[PDB]
């Protein structure tokens, strides 16, 4: 009844409407009902989420018992659980509300249920002035969400240079690993953020393998960011072999993800030149344990002559992309079985159901030997 009238008045910031419904009851009754969770949220959480500064001041004056209580707020259609007012106000960029809340004693590291801090939410949406204010009020840079993702990591992924720079200036550990072994360098690689990647390397950020065995260089090859790959293949921290495999894998990505055979052949020639650059140290192609029926029993081209006829034979190039991806990413990387299935589907759509079925059987046997489904298809939390 009136509980929801005060909830709405807070949500909408009609302060005179509120002090009307509120001037009746007693100081024991106001606090008892400003603490009432209408729809999973408190009046304070709503006032803060929507930046009603006077409304937040008035509510806190009456009773600060809800200042740390986590409720439910909406951002961009998603509902977040266990969010306290400070987290909501910083996620939404209401710097004035953030200042008010910390004045009234809001805990600066009080997280959501996903262990996202107010600092993390501010880094996600790129609120630099809030990021600075939170850090200057003892926000802990190194508190990561439940996945092990950090404020530095999410800043890199979203390309917020200025925020990434600020966190690094203020001491953020550039070599944190998430639970799946992801580092901020990986986040830069996956987002194409070359400028932020360079910045991280000013801080001697180590290039490392994640859980999937992926260096930042490979991550950029898998997701197709050539600005990162061109940069890292000219970087002394990557060996000749890592450079070749990244170029080769990126070409496979050009085939399967970018549907671009000209581009793919560029990187395969680039990588083949390097395999035969030192005439006395040939980096020969590895040989798999066996030929694969699903792959049409194809072998990776092992010289530059074998590459010259490739563009005229797209099916050969598509089998090359699959051979390369299994060689470099392995059966346990989700992209291997994924692109096997996608290539199978393209054969089904063009009418080659035997090739389709042999590739899907093989994706199934690969998936289930190393222990994104058809039905479904049909760490970056804020």
From Swiss-Prot:
GO terms for molecular function: ubiquitin-like ligase-substrate adaptor activity. Changing residue 75 to A: Strongly reduced binding to C-degron with an arginine at the C-terminus. Keywords: Acetylation, ANK repeat, Disease variant, Repeat, TPR repeat, Ubl conjugation pathway. Changing residue 125 to A: Reduced binding to C-degron with an arginine at the C-terminus. Abolished binding to C-degron with an arginine at the C-terminus. GO terms for cellular component: Cul2-RING ubiquitin ligase complex; cytosol; nucleoplasm; ubiquitin ligase complex. Belongs to the fem-1 family. Substrate-recognition component of a Cul2-RING (CRL2) E3 ubiquitin-protein ligase complex of the DesCEND (destruction via C-end degrons) pathway, which recognizes a C-degron located at the extreme C terminus of target proteins, leading to their ubiquitination and degradation. The C-degron recognized by the DesCEND pathway is usually a motif of less than ten residues and can be present in full-length proteins, truncated proteins or proteolytically cleaved forms. This is Protein fem-1 homolog C.
């Amino acid at each position: 009844d009136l509980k929801t009238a005060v909830f709405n008045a807070a949500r909408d910031g009609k302060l005179r409407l509120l002090t009307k419904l509120l001037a009746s009851k007693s100081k024991e009754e106001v606090s008892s009902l400003i603490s009432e969770k209408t729809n999973g949220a408190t009046p304070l959480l709503m006032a803060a989420r929507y930046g009603h500064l006077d409304m937040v001041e008035f509510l806190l004056e009456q009773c600060s018992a809800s200042i740390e209580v986590g409720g439910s707020v909406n951002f961009d259609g998603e509902t977040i659980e266990g969010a306290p007012p400070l987290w909501a106000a910083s996620a939404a960029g209401h710097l004035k509300v953030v200042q008010s809340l910390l004045n009234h004693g809001a805990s600066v590291n009080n997280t959501t249920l996903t262990n996202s801090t107010p600092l993390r939410a501010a880094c996600f949406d790129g609120h630099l002035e809030i990021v600075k204010y939170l850090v200057e009020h003892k926000a802990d840079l190194e508190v990561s969400n439940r996945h092990g993702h950090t404020c530095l990591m999410i800043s890199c992924y979203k390309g917020h240079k200025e925020i990434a720079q600020y966190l690094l200036e203020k001491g953020a550990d550039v070599n944190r690993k998430s639970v799946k072994g992801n580092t901020a360098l990986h986040d830069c690689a996956e987002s194409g953020s070359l400028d932020i990647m360079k910045m991280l390397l000013m801080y001697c950020a180590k290039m490392e393998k994640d859980g999937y065995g992926m260096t930042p260089l490979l991550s950029a090859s898998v997701t197709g960011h050539t600005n990162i790959v061109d940069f890292l293949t000219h970087h002394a921290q990557t060996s000749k072999t890592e450079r070749i495999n990244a170029l080769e894998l990126l070409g496979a990505t050009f085939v399967d993800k970018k549907r671009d055979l000209l581009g793919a052949l560029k990187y395969w020639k680039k990588a083949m030149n390097m395999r035969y650059s030192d005439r006395t140290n040939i980096i020969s192609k590895p040989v798999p344990q066996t030929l694969i029926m699903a792959y049409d029993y194809a072998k990776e081209v092992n010289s530059a002559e074998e590459l010259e006829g490739l563009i005229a034979d797209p099916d050969e190039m598509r089998m090359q992309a699959l051979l390369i991806r299994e060689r470099i990413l392995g059966p346990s990387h989700p992209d291997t079985s994924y692109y096997i299935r996608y290539r199978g589907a393209v054969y089904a759509d063009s009418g080659n159901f035997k090739r389709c079925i042999n590739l899907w059987k093989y994706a199934l046997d690969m998936q289930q030997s190393n222990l994104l489904s058809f039905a479904e298809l049909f760490r970056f939390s804020r």
